[PDB]
Design a protein around this ligand. Structure first.
Ligand SMILES: [Cl-]
Lengths: 250, 251
């Protein structure tokens, strides 16, 4: 055993082995996790994508969204055959986040992935800091559970809706960079998704001339990128960002 | 607007997010295909359902021929070997014809440049770059001639200021292509690999000391990213880069 150690832990051609399957790397069978902002377009689509790929998922959003979370979770549980549950939490409330940690463990079993899907005078600077601490503490309990259960996982941070988004975006990105460096050894990856203009419904012509694809993204085009980053397909990807913006930045 | 941008595709029971990652019905090619990244990326695309041409130098014809068989057998798609010296525009012209003849069209390409006395270093780099640029070019010429979209993926890997110079040029090229070809339904992206193993135990932990994951990547860990960028899973992704480096850039 001198060279045949490097050959055991570093195959050059996994695809040669009949038991290797590239598509199974995008599967979430056996995996459990949660999605914040889950009553919204990005969150519930990401959650449905993970559930259809085989994960158990907790849908997390504000207590005021309970009935929507409960209906979405029943619908996904039925359509995809996994345990999708609803867990209300206002993550700016410390006690509720502590309770969420308990209920994730007690109702899911463990946490393998978290999609921390954050929503965006001197009032703005106060509310930016409040919502960032909410994001931070939610990611924190996610990786505490991972560590406490002795396994790895995947954290995915995003922010969606000018100075406020830019400052929030920069903060989250630096936050994910440090997590990626500090938790890599616990098997925990951290990445961000930076969405461009995504359709969300009425409640144009100018901003689409900016976008080289000349259209908006849909919620499912973010959801497929979340599945990549949450799945083993992205097992060597940490500390980075995926821009999903139709070319906006280019 | 109503019907153009659906909000919850998952509510259709004949929709699946996992079909986005399939390459069934797709055809394309991979350069540097005898090397680690290229053959692993070819095998990923073929396993996912694509017909694939393996392109590399004429000196690799036998390797490519065996690789094409290995993958045709394992995955049931048409995988072929096409040698080409891509610094020769005549050969690249013939490569374009052979691709259209033997595959039917090109939907994706993984342009996988290798790296690699002052005048000579700059000349070597620019010849290498230009080989990448023109194989990229025949790919989107074929897409546009045949009236459909596609996906281009560019990477440079070791085969350091020469590597850095090559990486910056390819990134600019892909940014330009992504802007220019979006109208034609053609995406272009890059992959930036970190330390990937392709064949001393303390010299091991030596360079891993600045990799947070404290291990080398493996060729399959780049292949799966190639598959993500080639498939409809990344349909709103263009003009950007995916770094696959085990945390190297955030140490
Ligand atoms: Cl959050």
């Amino acid at each position: 055993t001198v060279e045949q150690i490097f050959d055991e832990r570093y195959p050059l051609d996994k695809w040669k082995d009949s038991n290797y399957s590239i598509l199974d790397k995008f599967s979430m069978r056996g995996r459990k996790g949660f999605v914040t902002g889950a009553a919204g377009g990005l969150g519930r689509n990401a959650a449905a994508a993970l559930a259809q790929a085989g994960a158990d998922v907790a849908l997390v959003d504000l207590p005021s969204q309970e009935d929507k979370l409960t209906e979405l979770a029943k619908d996904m549980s039925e359509r995809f055959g996994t345990n999708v549950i609803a867990l209300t939490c206002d993550v700016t409330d410390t006690v509720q986040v502590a309770e969420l940690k308990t209920q994730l463990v007690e109702q899911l079993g463990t946490v393998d992935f978290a999609f921390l899907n954050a929503g965006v005078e001197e009032v703005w600077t106060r509310t930016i800091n409040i919502n960032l601490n909410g994001t931070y503490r939610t990611g924190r309990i996610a990786h505490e559970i991972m560590r406490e259960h002795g396994h790895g996982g995947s954290l995915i941070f995003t922010a969606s809706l000018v100075n406020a988004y830019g400052a929030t975006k920069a903060a989250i990105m630096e936050h994910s960079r440090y997590l990626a460096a500090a938790l890599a050894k616990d098997g925990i990856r951290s990445n961000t998704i930076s969405p461009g203009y995504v359709w969300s419904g009425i409640f144009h012509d100018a901003m689409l001339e900016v976008v080289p694809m000349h259209r908006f993204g849909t919620n499912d085009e973010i959801a497929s990128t979340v599945l990549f980053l949450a799945s083993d397909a992205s097992s060597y990807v940490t500390g980075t960002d995926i821009r999903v913006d139709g070319g906006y930045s280019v």
